[PDB]
Amino acid sequence: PEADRELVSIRRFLKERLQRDYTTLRGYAKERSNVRLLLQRTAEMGESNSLLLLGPRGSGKTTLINSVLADLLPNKSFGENTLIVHLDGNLHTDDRVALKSITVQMQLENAADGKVFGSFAENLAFLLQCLKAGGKHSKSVIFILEEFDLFCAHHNQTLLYNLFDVSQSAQAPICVLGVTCRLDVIELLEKRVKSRFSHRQVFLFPSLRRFEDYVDLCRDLLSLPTGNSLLLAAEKIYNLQNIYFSRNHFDPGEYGFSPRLRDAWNKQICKVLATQQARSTLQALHDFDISEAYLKNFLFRLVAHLRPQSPHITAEKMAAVGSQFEGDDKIELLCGLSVLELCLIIAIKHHSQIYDRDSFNFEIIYARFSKFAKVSTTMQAVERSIVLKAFEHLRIAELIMPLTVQKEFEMHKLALTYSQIHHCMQRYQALPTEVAQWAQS
Amino acid sequence: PLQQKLMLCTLVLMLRNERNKDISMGRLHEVYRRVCAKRNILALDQAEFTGTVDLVETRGILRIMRKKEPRLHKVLLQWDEEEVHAALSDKQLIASILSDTACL
Amino acid sequence: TPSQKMKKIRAGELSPSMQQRTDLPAKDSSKSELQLAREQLHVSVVPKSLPCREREFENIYAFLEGKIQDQCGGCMYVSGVPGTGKTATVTGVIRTLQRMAKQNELPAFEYLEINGMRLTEPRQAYVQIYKQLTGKTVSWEQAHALLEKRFTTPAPRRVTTVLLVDELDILCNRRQDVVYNLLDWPTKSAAKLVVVTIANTMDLPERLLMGKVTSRLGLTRLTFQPYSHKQLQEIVTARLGGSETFKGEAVQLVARKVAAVSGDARRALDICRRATEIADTAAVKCVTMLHVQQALAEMIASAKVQAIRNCSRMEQIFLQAIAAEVTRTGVEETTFMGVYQQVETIAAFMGVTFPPPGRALRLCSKLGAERLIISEHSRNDLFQKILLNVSADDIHYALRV
Amino acid sequence: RTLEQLVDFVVGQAEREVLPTAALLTGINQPDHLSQFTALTQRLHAQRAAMVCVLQSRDCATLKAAVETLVFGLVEDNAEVERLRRSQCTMKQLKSWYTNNFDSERRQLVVILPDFECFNASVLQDLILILSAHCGSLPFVLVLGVATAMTAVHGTLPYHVSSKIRLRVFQTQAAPTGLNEVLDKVLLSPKYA
Amino acid sequence: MEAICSSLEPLFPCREAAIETLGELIGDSSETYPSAIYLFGHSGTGKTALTRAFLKECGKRQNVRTAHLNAIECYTTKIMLEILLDSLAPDQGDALKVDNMLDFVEQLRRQAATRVEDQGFLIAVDNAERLRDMDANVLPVLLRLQELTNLNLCVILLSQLPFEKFYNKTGLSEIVCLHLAQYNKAETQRILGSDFQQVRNQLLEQKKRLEICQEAVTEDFYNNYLNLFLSVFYKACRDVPELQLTARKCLSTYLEPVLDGSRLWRHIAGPLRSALTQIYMRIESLELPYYAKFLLIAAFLASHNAAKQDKRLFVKLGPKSFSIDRLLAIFYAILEEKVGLTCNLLSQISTLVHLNLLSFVSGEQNIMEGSARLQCTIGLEFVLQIGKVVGFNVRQYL
DNA sequence: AGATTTTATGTTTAGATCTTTTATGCTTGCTTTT
DNA sequence: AAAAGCAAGCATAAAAGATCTAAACATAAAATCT
Ligand SMILES: Nc1ncnc2c1ncn2[C@@H]1O[C@H](COP(=O)(O)OP(=O)(O)OP(=O)(O)O)[C@@H](O)[C@H]1O
Ligand SMILES: Nc1ncnc2c1ncn2[C@@H]1O[C@H](COP(=O)(O)OP(=O)(O)OP(=O)(O)O)[C@@H](O)[C@H]1O
Ligand SMILES: Nc1ncnc2c1ncn2[C@@H]1O[C@H](COP(=O)(O)OP(=O)(O)OP(=O)(O)O)[C@@H](O)[C@H]1O
Numbered sequence A: 001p002e003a004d005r006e007l008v009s010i011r012r013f014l015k016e017r018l019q020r021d022y023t024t025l026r027g028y029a030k031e032r033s034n035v036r037l038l039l040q041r042t043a044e045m046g047e048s049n050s051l052l053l054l055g056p057r058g059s060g061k062t063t064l065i066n067s068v069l070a071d072l073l074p075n076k077s078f079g080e081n082t083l084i085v086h087l088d089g090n091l092h093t094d095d096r097v098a099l100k101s102i103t104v105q106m107q108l109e110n111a112a113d114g115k116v117f118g119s120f121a122e123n124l125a126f127l128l129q130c131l132k133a134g135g136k137h138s139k140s141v142i143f144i145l146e147e148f149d150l151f152c153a154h155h156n157q158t159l160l161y162n163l164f165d166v167s168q169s170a171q172a173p174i175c176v177l178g179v180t181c182r183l184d185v186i187e188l189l190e191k192r193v194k195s196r197f198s199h200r201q202v203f204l205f206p207s208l209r210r211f212e213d214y215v216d217l218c219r220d221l222l223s224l225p226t227g228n229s230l231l232l233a234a235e236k237i238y239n240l241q242n243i244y245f246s247r248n249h250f251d252p253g254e255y256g257f258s259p260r261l262r263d264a265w266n267k268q269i270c271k272v273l274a275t276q277q278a279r280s281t282l283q284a285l286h287d288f289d290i291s292e293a294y295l296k297n298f299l300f301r302l303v304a305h306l307r308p309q310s311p312h313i314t315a316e317k318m319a320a321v322g323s324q325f326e327g328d329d330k331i332e333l334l335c336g337l338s339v340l341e342l343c344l345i346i347a348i349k350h351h352s353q354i355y356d357r358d359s360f361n362f363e364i365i366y367a368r369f370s371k372f373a374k375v376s377t378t379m380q381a382v383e384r385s386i387v388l389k390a391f392e393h394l395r396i397a398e399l400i401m402p403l404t405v406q407k408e409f410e411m412h413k414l415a416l417t418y419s420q421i422h423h424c425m426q427r428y429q430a431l432p433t434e435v436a437q438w439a440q441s
Numbered sequence B: 001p002l003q004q005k006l007m008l009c010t011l012v013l014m015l016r017n018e019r020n021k022d023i024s025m026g027r028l029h030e031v032y033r034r035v036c037a038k039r040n041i042l043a044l045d046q047a048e049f050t051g052t053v054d055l056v057e058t059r060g061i062l063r064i065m066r067k068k069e070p071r072l073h074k075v076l077l078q079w080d081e082e083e084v085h086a087a088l089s090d091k092q093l094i095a096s097i098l099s100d101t102a103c104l
Numbered sequence C: 001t002p003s004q005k006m007k008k009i010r011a012g013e014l015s016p017s018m019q020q021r022t023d024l025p026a027k028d029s030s031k032s033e034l035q036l037a038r039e040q041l042h043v044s045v046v047p048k049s050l051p052c053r054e055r056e057f058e059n060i061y062a063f064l065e066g067k068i069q070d071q072c073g074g075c076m077y078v079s080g081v082p083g084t085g086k087t088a089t090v091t092g093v094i095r096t097l098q099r100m101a102k103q104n105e106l107p108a109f110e111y112l113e114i115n116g117m118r119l120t121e122p123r124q125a126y127v128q129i130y131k132q133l134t135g136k137t138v139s140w141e142q143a144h145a146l147l148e149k150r151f152t153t154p155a156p157r158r159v160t161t162v163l164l165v166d167e168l169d170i171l172c173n174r175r176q177d178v179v180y181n182l183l184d185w186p187t188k189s190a191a192k193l194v195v196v197t198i199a200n201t202m203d204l205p206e207r208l209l210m211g212k213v214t215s216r217l218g219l220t221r222l223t224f225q226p227y228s229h230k231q232l233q234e235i236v237t238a239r240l241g242g243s244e245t246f247k248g249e250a251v252q253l254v255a256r257k258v259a260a261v262s263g264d265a266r267r268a269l270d271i272c273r274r275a276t277e278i279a280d281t282a283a284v285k286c287v288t289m290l291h292v293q294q295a296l297a298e299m300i301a302s303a304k305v306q307a308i309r310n311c312s313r314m315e316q317i318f319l320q321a322i323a324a325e326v327t328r329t330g331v332e333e334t335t336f337m338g339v340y341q342q343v344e345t346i347a348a349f350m351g352v353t354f355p356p357p358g359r360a361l362r363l364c365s366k367l368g369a370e371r372l373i374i375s376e377h378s379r380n381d382l383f384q385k386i387l388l389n390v391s392a393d394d395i396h397y398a399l400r401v
Numbered sequence D: 001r002t003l004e005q006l007v008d009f010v011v012g013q014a015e016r017e018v019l020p021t022a023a024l025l026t027g028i029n030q031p032d033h034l035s036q037f038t039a040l041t042q043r044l045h046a047q048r049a050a051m052v053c054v055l056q057s058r059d060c061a062t063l064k065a066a067v068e069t070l071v072f073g074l075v076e077d078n079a080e081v082e083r084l085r086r087s088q089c090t091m092k093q094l095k096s097w098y099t100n101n102f103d104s105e106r107r108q109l110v111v112i113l114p115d116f117e118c119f120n121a122s123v124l125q126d127l128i129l130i131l132s133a134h135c136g137s138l139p140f141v142l143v144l145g146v147a148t149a150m151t152a153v154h155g156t157l158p159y160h161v162s163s164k165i166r167l168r169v170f171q172t173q174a175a176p177t178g179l180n181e182v183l184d185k186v187l188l189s190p191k192y193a
Numbered sequence E: 001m002e003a004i005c006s007s008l009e010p011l012f013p014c015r016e017a018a019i020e021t022l023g024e025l026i027g028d029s030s031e032t033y034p035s036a037i038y039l040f041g042h043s044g045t046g047k048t049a050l051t052r053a054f055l056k057e058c059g060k061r062q063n064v065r066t067a068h069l070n071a072i073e074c075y076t077t078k079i080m081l082e083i084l085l086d087s088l089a090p091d092q093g094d095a096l097k098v099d100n101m102l103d104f105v106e107q108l109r110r111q112a113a114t115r116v117e118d119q120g121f122l123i124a125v126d127n128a129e130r131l132r133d134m135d136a137n138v139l140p141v142l143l144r145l146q147e148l149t150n151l152n153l154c155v156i157l158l159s160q161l162p163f164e165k166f167y168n169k170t171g172l173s174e175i176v177c178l179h180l181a182q183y184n185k186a187e188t189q190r191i192l193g194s195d196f197q198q199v200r201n202q203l204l205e206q207k208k209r210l211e212i213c214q215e216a217v218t219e220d221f222y223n224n225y226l227n228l229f230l231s232v233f234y235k236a237c238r239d240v241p242e243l244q245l246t247a248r249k250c251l252s253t254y255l256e257p258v259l260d261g262s263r264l265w266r267h268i269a270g271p272l273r274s275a276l277t278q279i280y281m282r283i284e285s286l287e288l289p290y291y292a293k294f295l296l297i298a299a300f301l302a303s304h305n306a307a308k309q310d311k312r313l314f315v316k317l318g319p320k321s322f323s324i325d326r327l328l329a330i331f332y333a334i335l336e337e338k339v340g341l342t343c344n345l346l347s348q349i350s351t352l353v354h355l356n357l358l359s360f361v362s363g364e365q366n367i368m369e370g371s372a373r374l375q376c377t378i379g380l381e382f383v384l385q386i387g388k389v390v391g392f393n394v395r396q397y398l
Numbered sequence F: 001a002g003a004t005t006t007t008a009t010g011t012t013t014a015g016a017t018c019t020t021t022t023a024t025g026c027t028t029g030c031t032t033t034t
Numbered sequence G: 001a002a003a004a005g006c007a008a009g010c011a012t013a014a015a016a017g018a019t020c021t022a023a024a025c026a027t028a029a030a031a032t033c034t
């Protein structure tokens, strides 16, 4: 069957685009132009700059940096006159780990095949002496410090004070480039380190606060591109792979759709996104979080469901994944509890409603439960030990949290709003009527 | 610097008008923004205001007790106001800020 | 074998070279005049003679020339807010003294220098001072012993040695042994050491140094005041030369709005470079005043109202309800439970439904990662505390106007 | 008699997920039972049916120290039947050592816990979850020494921890019965002068 | 992705939706993986066994390298990185060494290969709730290990908690949440009844009883017995392994009238309501010295009678704190014999503390200085039993 | 010219320290039942 | 009227929270034995 395999090619294409498109950048014209002209002036003119990408998580900061590096690196001038040192604040948790990584990535004489010799002090002295020994004739370094706010937390901010100071000095032309999500990262800096920082800052707020931009983004993310665009994209990716993410990138030349298939797919995508139901699902999704990582997660859950029996995306499929997104996940845990733990939570809700959210105890809740169990005519048979193990089963799900003493007398707090328990009372399967009457009063 | 003058005048005003000398950086910045708004001059953001108060701290006029967050840092004046008034050397401005009770 | 490389490094017999460019740097005559101003305005290009720091130059020069010619030794403490021309003036005085000693108008002298933030440990200064003498790298204990053998023992012909020490507050620690040794060595007659110490705080010897260390530091002191409205203009117009690429009102606005904040000179020399880069993309060859206004608005940024306006609608309802609970309860620290109740009230008013609390914790985590609010780890839901980091009037300014 | 029943329980697990485990309701007189557990190790080594670690409460203040003394006791006990540092005796090294030795033949990995009442509760529950995670790959048996009663075992083991427990109860004879036996057969014997 | 779900469905009845979602997200290895998946559910829901069978079938059928973990084992991050790279970089021997998170990312970056072979990696971390209690850079890196290593890997996480508990101050990357719902009564009956041939073979290997059982142990009989079992036991627990391990013993009691010649429900409903009281206890009287008994009931009166009532009872919320001298005073008041203060009596106090019959609610560091506070931790019925064996009527002093 | 303790050194983790802040407890000062 | 009972008040102290430091542990330079 040919129709069974074109859908597999479409699904692998859309999944590979949603997951591995590390250099494509929609939007940010002037900001990308600022970052590109700044790195270009550092590589050519020997200026020592510094920059600080800023913005909410999920906006394309790493994608912007990868786009600028992917368009600058194959120039055979930026690639020959500039060495690039990535650093990350989650992996380089101490100054000496980041310093050994700097010594390796710059290929200094004391590195020797990835095992740096000498102490942290000797590594800092050799790095600063190599940087002081250079000049405009030396190669430009481009430091890229992702998670810069964690680099601010290091002792004395000492590595930061070095990395800025070379940028303030007539030494090697380096370009420090922090990338961080906090909008007030600059007040974390020490006043000396803040003085040596050049205060230019690039904010990357997403450009799709309007809903129509969100619908256009969801349409462009699902449509199959024209084949000449696949040729130009594969040409650019081959140019960045002849010279890091390039070992496992998109490579869109592996997939080549027929014009009738691309036309039928883009027709079905425009017809689905013209519907009021898909627009209502995207409206709720845009109302929660506008960031592109959220939409790509929703679209990956949508594209993953394209079985050969059902090739087409439809508005009911987007409504099903959107109903999967919006549901409360603590009510779905409360519905899985057995009737004894549900009676314990109802006794906890009664003790909280009566005493105005005072902290409870296993003894108080067991007494309030036994006052119902003596007349329940189905709960007479339970032992105190079974109710105690049910209370511990409530405690390990973090539906009950300790105030931070014997395990039967420790004070506790309910972790639920009353509306969540009230919706559990309606969503519960095969609830006995005695518990449903006791819950009302 | 003029912003350091406005910060010292708002700190003297909040220390004079209030029995509780537990002044945070955010509680001081919220009054400093209203004082700059009534003076019809542009106010610094909190990220620059923290560096301004840190630069005033080097003179010994203040002492900042650090906390978990930059908003929660506690400014503590270490000069008396009779010295702060002679140090600012702009009595026509301090007479305007200290008579501005309504902006607190 | 690597050990021969490390031994040649620790003995100093191989200089630490850095890789050279494959392509030659561009010639000076191909540069535009605006590029010439952009490279004269770089902060790394120290002038040969600093404008507006003549009095401090005479002070440090008279102190160092008297300490060198008298062959006695001593100490000095210069201090001031960053960017005020401290280290540039001290190195300019020392370069002038070296130019004078080269012509035999002055006795010759050695010039050691350290910096307290280039050292991982306070004791590593012993490793570095000895590295400016012999060039060998040794352990700090052997280096301290050899430095005591050099300074305590009179060995003619001993030459005068000037030990500049930037960043004195990093060298302190609790024991204060390193700063005590560095200030105690000049007091011995055998050592001709003249130590100069640069720092930021004016009150450092009384604030954190010990009483004997403050007694050794002495009463000779100098304070670098912040640059005023006029000195910052003289600095930038000295950097530009005779070029008219900057308007005089543009430099006046840069100096007027930088001197009002800090008095840093690096801020003025960075804002003028950004103004040159802004004028370059407009294809004009003179930096007119609105380019300076755009560069000033960019580099004294205040982008939190843009962040609140760019938030998703449920996050804006959350930011309204946190300030609503702050106004209602009075205290500035609110639990998530009352914030969620005010969220349900505001969402019932606006007509949109709100996400259930497990998604409201995701909204609170996003605002706490963006630092629009301060919030705890999410493991203690409904009882986590939510400080508002942005001011309450900024939220209404974002969501009304 | 209780020794033969415990050895038959360990060999029956060896003939064959939850970890099999055997509560031993021993008396209040805790020091006396070290000879009992030593006789159990002697029988299990003489049959070549198992290798035994013994986890004292003094050695296990934290989960790290408990895992280190457990792996060190199993490896050094096997070395003493026929010295790595305690920093490196990870459970991964225990799995690699068991695969290098006894995968070709299955020896049980008995872990005596003589003073069950003296343990930290969180360390003991985390250790039971760790030993339950390795069942199938590593055959564990967890005999215990409960000086009080089985209600203490049901109290200190929560719903999650007791979900992975298949315990069997053995009972040591009462201390007054042992005193009466010693007083009648020894101190009243005709043969002593 | 079809063969894996076809091979897992017979092992896992009533999980066709979860197996279908797992085989859509991380089934085929040629297709790119989501960066992280978080499936969650209650105890007994079958997530550890499901991810183990799924990782085993994907590793046998395809090119993937699987790595299963228990995060309780990883008290330090170096243990987790060494086990993760022992599984994802096979046959490295004892030469394997990982210093920190950076070395793990670099050595996983070395494992990337050509796209023709379509390799994949998979990491399951059971007990993922412990990941938020450790180094606070393990969880954010694990949620973007695919972007960091440039490598086709998904990091599955397994916990009893929703992902709303897992957010930190710095935020987190996106994750594909998945919910394993616990079964209703009908699906639980189908799951308990899915092992019918095993119990039928177990009875047929265990001789008139053999033919009278094999002619009457057919599928409707086991289904009706499981209906009679779940009519009483589903109220206390929905936990499937506990229902299995109790239902086998209850069938062993239930089967006797059929072997010995409705008409069954009352004979089992005797024992069935006895097994209901022994639920969660997984089983297949505290003798004391005399003066230890008096010390224990005196500690119970000290923790139960409050400080003010001793003056009226002895001159002749929770359990209360009591100092050791208050315990000795109540012990001498109730003893009515007056033994001396030997070493053995205070040794009995300390060894009652060591057995968790008493407790140290405070003090601890200064037991001898008199600042120590003890708290009795036993129930009233054990005290009444001790007072029966002793002959001291405790209820007079309460 | 190569293997072995030997020693000197650097790192890391557990413990001492500084500082805030919060609390039970030690004492006080009335306070009130028997 | 006598002695048990509730607010008040400073105080050792207890958590804690950052912070600095001393000793245990991993590791490299090197005399030493072959
Ligand atoms: N402007 C954009 N153009 C293209 N893709 C984008 C853009 N913004 C976000 N994305 C998508 O969002 C997802 C995450 O983006 P990205 O990795 O750039 O965020 P990030 O900058 O790493 O955030 P953080 O650094 O805070 O984790 C990516 O899959 C990327 O495809
Ligand atoms: N009076 C001046 N004239 C010309 N240029 C100046 C003047 N003052 C400062 N600069 C420029 O600003 C920079 C200030 O550097 P300098 O080392 O003097 O700062 P600093 O006061 O030592 O800072 P910190 O105290 O943070 O170390 C110099 O590189 C110089 O180019
Ligand atoms: N749908 C099912 N069909 C058959 N057996 C099941 C099913 N669900 C669970 N089980 C059984 O449950 C047993 C163990 O469950 P498992 O340990 O996977 O639960 P868990 O979620 O890991 O528990 P915990 O969260 O407490 O670790 C397995 O032996 C398995 O046979």
Ligand SMILES: [Mg+2]
Pocket (backbone or CB within 6 Å): A061, A062, A146
């Ligand atoms: Mg990123």
Ligand SMILES: [Mg+2]
Pocket (backbone or CB within 6 Å): C086, C087, C166, C198
């Ligand atoms: Mg300086």
Ligand SMILES: [Mg+2]
Pocket (backbone or CB within 6 Å): E047, E048, E126
């Ligand atoms: Mg499990």
